[PDB]
Nucleic acid binder design. Structure first.
Ligand SMILES: [Mg+2]
Ligand SMILES: [Mg+2]
Ligand SMILES: [Mg+2]
Ligand SMILES: [Mg+2]
Ligand SMILES: [Mg+2]
Ligand SMILES: [Mg+2]
Ligand SMILES: [Mg+2]
Ligand SMILES: [Mg+2]
Ligand SMILES: [Mg+2]
Ligand SMILES: [Mg+2]
Ligand SMILES: [Mg+2]
Ligand SMILES: [Mg+2]
Ligand SMILES: [Mg+2]
Ligand SMILES: [Mg+2]
Ligand SMILES: [Mg+2]
Ligand SMILES: [Mg+2]
Ligand SMILES: [Mg+2]
Ligand SMILES: [Mg+2]
Ligand SMILES: [Mg+2]
Ligand SMILES: [Mg+2]
Ligand SMILES: [Mg+2]
Ligand SMILES: [Mg+2]
Ligand SMILES: [Mg+2]
Ligand SMILES: [Mg+2]
Ligand SMILES: [Mg+2]
Ligand SMILES: [Mg+2]
Ligand SMILES: [Mg+2]
Ligand SMILES: [Mg+2]
Ligand SMILES: [Mg+2]
Ligand SMILES: [Mg+2]
Ligand SMILES: [Mg+2]
Ligand SMILES: [Mg+2]
Ligand SMILES: [Mg+2]
Ligand SMILES: [Mg+2]
Ligand SMILES: [Mg+2]
Ligand SMILES: [Mg+2]
Ligand SMILES: [Mg+2]
Ligand SMILES: [Mg+2]
Ligand SMILES: [Mg+2]
Ligand SMILES: [Mg+2]
Ligand SMILES: [Mg+2]
Ligand SMILES: [Mg+2]
Ligand SMILES: [Mg+2]
Ligand SMILES: [Mg+2]
Ligand SMILES: [Mg+2]
Lengths: 260, 155, 188, 125
RNA sequence: GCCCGUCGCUAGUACCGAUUGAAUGGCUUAGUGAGGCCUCAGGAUUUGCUUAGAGAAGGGGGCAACUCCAUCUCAGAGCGAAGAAUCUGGUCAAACUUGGUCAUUUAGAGGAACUAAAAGUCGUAACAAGGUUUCCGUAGGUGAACCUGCGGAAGGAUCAUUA
RNA sequence: ACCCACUCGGCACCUUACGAGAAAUCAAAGUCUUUGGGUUCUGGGGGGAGUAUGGUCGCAAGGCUGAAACUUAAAGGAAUUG
RNA sequence: AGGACUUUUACUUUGAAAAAAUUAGAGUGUUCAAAGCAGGCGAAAGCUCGAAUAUAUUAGCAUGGAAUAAUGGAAUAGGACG
RNA sequence: CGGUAAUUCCAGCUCCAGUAGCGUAUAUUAAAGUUGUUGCAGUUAAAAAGCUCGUAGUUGAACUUUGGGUCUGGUUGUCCG
RNA sequence: UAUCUGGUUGAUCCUGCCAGUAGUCAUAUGCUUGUCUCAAAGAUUAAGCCAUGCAUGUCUAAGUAUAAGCAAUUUAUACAGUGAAACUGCGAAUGGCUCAUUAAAUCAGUUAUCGUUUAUUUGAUAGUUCCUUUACUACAUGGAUAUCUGUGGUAAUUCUAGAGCUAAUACAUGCUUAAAAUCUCGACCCUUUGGAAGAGAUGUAUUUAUUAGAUAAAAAAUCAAUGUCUUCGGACUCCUUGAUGAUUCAUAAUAACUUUUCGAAUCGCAUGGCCUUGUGCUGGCGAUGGUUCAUUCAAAUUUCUGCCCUAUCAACUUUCGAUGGUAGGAUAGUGGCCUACCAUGGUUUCAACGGGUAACGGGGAAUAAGGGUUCGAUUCCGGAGAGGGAGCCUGAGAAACGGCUACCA
């Protein structure tokens, strides 16, 4: 290819958009935006598929055009906008508010979350740098560039953007014994506590995570998103809280909780 | 294989943008710039007080060490300012469940701070493309001799 | 059309690589600037991703810096006397990076005169007190005074006129200058 | 370029196509249950062979192994739900003991015949 | 009984092959080298600043430096700025001519074969002690199988002479 | 120099199968479907054929390396009765 | 969480990674099946569980083990400690 | 098989196999323990270089803490609550 | 989905192959053919040649309207409605097809960019354009130019020359506009601790020099220089510094430099508030732009390991770059990528180099006790190509071919 690629064939779309392998040759390629397309979620997928509020492409276009979708307090009238992790989608119709958090199967689950907390958003600090005229600034995972941050905010840390002014409200410092979320690999959706963070001089940090069920795994640091203090998450965790029940345990859940 | 003259060629040999002020009367040797490549790799004292220049020195030159770290054995030290390292390994043929001795020849660029010779095992590190074929800079001469540390025998 | 890809080169082993693909546009190389002296004539070239480049053929004057007291002045390049790569450029007066040129050297001269006033080659009370505070610390070395009496300074260019379009460099000074005189005395 | 959907064969003709005893047994099973062709017996034998392959693979695995537990009881419940495996022998070792006639018996043909609303097997067909 | 070769007939396969062949392609010595790109020049034309003196008639809103005016308008001349054809040296280099080279196809007089076809011909080598035991290496000979010489070997026709 | 006993090494030999082989037979041709001590070379039906070609060695003789086209349902091993 | 020395491997356990489709395989009456990722349940008055898992046997990264296999120490002591 | 009684050719009758499929051709896989690492053979069936030395390759003798006692944690089958 | 059978003989036991057997998202073909679901499909030889028709153009309330186009009616003295054409902007480099070339080449897994460019999307981002500021358009600067009106040419082509008006987010210019602080240069005085009227420059962008960008831990004396306060002994106690594993990094500062980049002379809707009641002062929501830094889509390179057959291919590469050094040129950037001068080096029995591939690599397919064997042109990911070759404009992105230039066919 000579230049950028602008088509996403259906099989090549991520298995987390988890579309239908039939009924279409192509899949919505997310336009450039705040999130990686492999990690993001187009608005058309979130509305037509996840919510079923629409039926097809024209309906999603009509929905977005009339300015009822509000991604993080902004309209975002483009069909393939990459609404990524921890973004907030507001529909004044049905007065509903969603926050995108992976369900433990590892998918962008529909999370109806309250209006009061929908005012703010969480973010991971991916860079802390000194821009022109000696002005410190911080780059989050959304690509948001927050100017004049707290002087002791470091990389891999987490922050609580007020999402109205777009400035820093509070922040959480990365360290052991801290509630944490996972955003990549087999451990998608898993939530736990940081037990240890082995350094590995030369690259590719690893952290060990122990969840409430007392199960333990290990994940890359790029893959990690501190979410609060144990017992006190800073957001509303989805149904199941990412315990990753075993397949037999899931079968027992299906058998036990069963009413028809 | 190193010339006595600290610069021997037509162009002058300086470390770029490190300047010694002659109008000042400190009159030290020069202002030699240096750095540590990290990974717990000790910069050699021969580089710390050396007088060579070696644009592609991991310790004094502009090149930075990042990426692969390969340990091998010197097979050719007799081409200028550069080394040829034999890396041996075993390829696993699965149709027989048997291994197969194999070797690759990795060129690299040994700084004058190191004294190398045929047979020294060497820890080398990745860097930018330095020449057409060299991509690694010698970072440690682990076995200076190996079995030639004791040479004579006088009881 | 001048490519700089590695495909046309033989392999490290020495085998003759067969042609894999016809050479691309992101591998192009352009003609050498081979700049000259006189009648400033800079040609813009639109390179990859915009980013105007400036060919600086036929350049006469440029900025030059003095490191000891650290002062920069615009001055004229007057010929090239040494080139570490090819003496053919010296014979053709081709000006590229790291070439060694001569300088009209006047602006440095009366800057020195208005700054220290030592009358090389051989008032308000504020200026007098500044000079007294200086206390004859301007003990700059002898060879630069020798060419100051000669009138032409020995400078080594540091900018790349082929890319930048400018003609900036710094005067040889300290042991630097010494080395090159040896080479020049080899030429002499 | 659209994503294909996977067609797959559902039978397997025997390698010795001309065995007298096997041919007579196939004709017995065809006449007993009114099968149109002998591809029906091949299909049931193929389904049984897949079932037995899964059962033997799970048997090879160690006892009290999550794979063994999960898929073994999944196959057990599927077979008892079909009805071919009696509730008495939900052990995954009697799964290897099922015969082709067992799956033949659960066909809607033979079930309509058993209920009696059809008085003949071909009448049921 | 079985079978060996020469010569004789038929169909096929393959090889050598003088013809110093023919085609194609690959490279390639040598000589030309379109066109683009860069550069040296060049300078049709388009223009702007200028007072460069006219008719314009208050070609300022006061016969006159219009109480000039984005005034009519060319000889101006300069100073620019853009600037086509053309053109200097390179540079990428397609391709052409000329031979050379290799590879594959490609015929080709003629020659030496091998198969299959077994009711031709001349012998009867081998299988028995095959009627000279057989076979191997090497050399010579001859219609043909084969014969002979010198060394072997038993796959021999002897596992055996203290008779 | 013999005689008796023992031992190491060598060319060998007799008996036997309790082992191996298609058997003739083998004390290794055993310890091989109860299949793995280390290691080198060679063969994949017969013929064409150890032929042609291309190398290479040789003064020459010839040696080393060495196919295919095509044809064929056998060629062959051991033993039994005539 | 910092200076300090790190014998080096081969091997093997665990984990992160090995795109989806495909293979395996869980759930699900497409009328069965090939398939598909659907669907199910209300009183009919919106309430819902899903879209499971595993494997890839090489190369790289981390990790526990130290049998098996290899290399290195102290012989001129230029050896180890205070 | 077919040379005057053809269970084999051409037909009629009967029957058999698969069945909306079946037959042929080439290629390929299992059969092929006829590619053999698992897993082939070499006395005579094809196949041990005429023999020896020898670099690379492959392989390479044994030996360097084995024991014990206690406490203690999970998982089992225990006897029963 | 661990199975064998017929054939050498008068007869037997073998070695052995031929044949049988069952496959085949392996095709072709023959004979038949009623139904539902599903579906491959000019790949194999010829990446051979192509008539014909389509396959990429695009306008929102929001760039430009004087179509002498339509509507002229309830909204209409510049303009508003709708809207051809054309200029402007953007895409045309995506998609689709084929597998010809290509055997450490592509590609796969795994790294790196502290070695670079990046339209767009998303988040931030700038007073200085004044230069002696006591004489300027900022209540808005200039000229062309298509569309169109008319005259043609050619046999014809998306061929367009001449004339006449006309516009812009097209092309050109160009204005405000603060303060502050820091650097530099001095009309003087008064005997030192010298210390001060005052004057010019400093945004960003580019280029070059130099500096800062620290940091293992308690006290001294001392001369040399000289700074604050001095309650005239002397004390100096206070010094700020981000990130990575690492940097000449991020960033800041000084001196300068530039044939001086940007710093809104642009559009839509609503047109509120203050009364300094005038067209006066302010004033919201957007749309386009716009410098830099990030982020995203990426793009280039890049580390280790992995490729089929062949020795009837054993040495291969370097005067023409072969391996390395240095400097320069070019590159967006590292790099013999190219040049100049040096060194004579690099690969190879662990198969290099050469030859063959009816070879694109892979995810995968068939086959199936286990080990494997064969296939993979093709529904996904990469790569390459548009008859074979080279060359190039436009752009962020092409060596583009439903883009041009030339040669060959
Ligand atoms: Mg494409
Ligand atoms: Mg014939
Ligand atoms: Mg020319
Ligand atoms: Mg006769
Ligand atoms: Mg005879
Ligand atoms: Mg005889
Ligand atoms: Mg006789
Ligand atoms: Mg006789
Ligand atoms: Mg044979
Ligand atoms: Mg023979
Ligand atoms: Mg010969
Ligand atoms: Mg016999
Ligand atoms: Mg996959
Ligand atoms: Mg399936
Ligand atoms: Mg009859
Ligand atoms: Mg055999
Ligand atoms: Mg014989
Ligand atoms: Mg034999
Ligand atoms: Mg032998
Ligand atoms: Mg050896
Ligand atoms: Mg041992
Ligand atoms: Mg088998
Ligand atoms: Mg026989
Ligand atoms: Mg017979
Ligand atoms: Mg067969
Ligand atoms: Mg019907
Ligand atoms: Mg074709
Ligand atoms: Mg357009
Ligand atoms: Mg309109
Ligand atoms: Mg090749
Ligand atoms: Mg510095
Ligand atoms: Mg910097
Ligand atoms: Mg360089
Ligand atoms: Mg392939
Ligand atoms: Mg091909
Ligand atoms: Mg393919
Ligand atoms: Mg092909
Ligand atoms: Mg493709
Ligand atoms: Mg192309
Ligand atoms: Mg064509
Ligand atoms: Mg563009
Ligand atoms: Mg092209
Ligand atoms: Mg086309
Ligand atoms: Mg195209
Ligand atoms: Mg065109």
């Amino acid at each position: 290819a000579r230049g950028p690629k602008k088509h996403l064939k259906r099989l090549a779309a991520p298995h987390h958009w988890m579309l239908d392998k039939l009924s279409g040759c192509y899949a919505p390629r997310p336009s450039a935006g705040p999130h990686k397309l492999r990690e993001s979620l187009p608005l058309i997928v979130f509305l037509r598929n996840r919510l079923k509020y629409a039926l097809n492409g024209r309906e999603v276009k009509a929905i977005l055009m009339q300015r009822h979708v509000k991604v993080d307090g902004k309209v975002r009238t483009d069909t393939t906008f990459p609404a990524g992790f921890m973004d907030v989608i507001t529909l004044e119709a049905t007065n509903e508010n969603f926050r995108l958090v992976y369900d433990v199967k590892g998918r962008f689950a529909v999370h109806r979350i309250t209006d009061e907390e929908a005012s703010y958003k969480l973010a991971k600090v991916k860079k802390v740098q000194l821009g022109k005229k000696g002005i410190p600034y911080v780059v989050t995972h959304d690509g948001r560039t927050i100017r004049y941050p707290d002087p002791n905010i470091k990389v891999n840390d987490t922050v609580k953007v007020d999402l109205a002014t777009g400035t820093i409200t509070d922040f959480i410092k990365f360290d052991t014994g801290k509630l944490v979320y996972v955003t990549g690999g087999r451990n998608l959706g898993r939530v736990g506590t940081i037990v240890h963070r082995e350094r590995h001089e030369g690259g590719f940090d690893l952290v060990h995570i122990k969840d409430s069920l007392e199960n333990t795994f290990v994940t890359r640091l790029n893959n990690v998103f501190v979410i609060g203090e144990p017992g006190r998450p800073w957001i509303s965790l989805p149904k199941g809280k990412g315990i990753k029940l075993t397949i037999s345990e899931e079968r027992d859940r299906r058998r036990a909780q069963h009413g028809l | 294989s190193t010339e006595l003259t600290v610069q021997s060629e037509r162009a002058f040999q300086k470390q770029p943008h490190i300047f010694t002020n002659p109008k000042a009367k400190a009159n030290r040797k020069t202002k030699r710039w240096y750095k540590n490549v990290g990974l717990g790799f000790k910069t050699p004292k021969t580089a710390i007080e050396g007088s060579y220049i070696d644009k592609k020195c991991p310790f004094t030159g502009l090149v930075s060490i990042r990426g692969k770290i390969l340990t091998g054995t010197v097979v050719s030290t007799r081409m200028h300012r550069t080394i040829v390292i034999r890396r041996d390994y075993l390829h696993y043929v699965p149709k027989y469940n048997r291994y197969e001795k194999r070797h690759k020849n990795v060129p690299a660029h040994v700084s004058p701070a190191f004294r190398v010779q045929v047979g020294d095992i060497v820890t080398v590190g990745q860097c930018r493309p330095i020449s057409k074929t060299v991509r690694f800079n010698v970072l440690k001469v682990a076995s200076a001799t190996g079995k030639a540390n004791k040479q004579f025998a006088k009881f | 059309g001048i490519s700089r890809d590695s495909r046309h080169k033989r392999a490290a082993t020495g085998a003759k690589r067969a042609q894999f693909r016809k050479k691309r546009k992101f591998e192009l190389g352009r003609q050498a600037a081979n700049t000259k002296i006189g009648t400033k004539r800079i040609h813009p070239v639109r390179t990859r991703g915009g980013n105007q480049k400036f060919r600086a053929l036929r350049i006469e004057t440029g900025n030059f810096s003095w490191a000891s007291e650290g002062v920069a002045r615009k001055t004229r390049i007057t010929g090239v006397v040494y080139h570490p790569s090819n003496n053919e450029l010296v014979r053709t007066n081709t000006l590229t990076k790291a070439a060694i040129v001569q300088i009209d050297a006047t602006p440095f001269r009366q800057w020195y005169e208005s700054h220290y006033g030592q009358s090389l080659g051989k008032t308000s009370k504020n200026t007098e007190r500044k000079w007294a505070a200086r206390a004859a610390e301007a003990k700059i070395e002898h060879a630069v005074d020798s060419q100051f009496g000669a009138g032409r300074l020995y400078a080594a260019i540091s900018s790349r006129p082929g890319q930048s379009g400018r003609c900036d460099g710094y005067i040889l000074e300290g042991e630097e200058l010494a080395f090159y005189l040896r080479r020049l005395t080899a030429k002499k | 370029p659209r994503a294909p959907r996977t067609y797959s064969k559902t039978y397997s003709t025997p390698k010795r196509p001309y065995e007298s005893a096997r041919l007579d047994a196939e004709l017995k099973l065809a006449g007993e249950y009114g099968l149109k062709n002998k591809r029906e017996i091949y299909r049931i034998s193929f389904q049984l062979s897949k079932i037995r392959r899964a059962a033997r693979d799970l048997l090879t695995r160690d006892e009290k192994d999550p794979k063994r537990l999960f898929e073994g009881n999944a196959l057990i419940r599927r077979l008892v739900r079909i009805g071919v495996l009696s509730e008495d022998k939900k052990k995954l070792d009697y799964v290897l003991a099922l015969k082709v006639e067992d799956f033949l018996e659960r066909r809607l043909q033979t079930q309509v015949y058993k209920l009696g609303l059809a008085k003949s097997v071909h009448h049921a067909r």
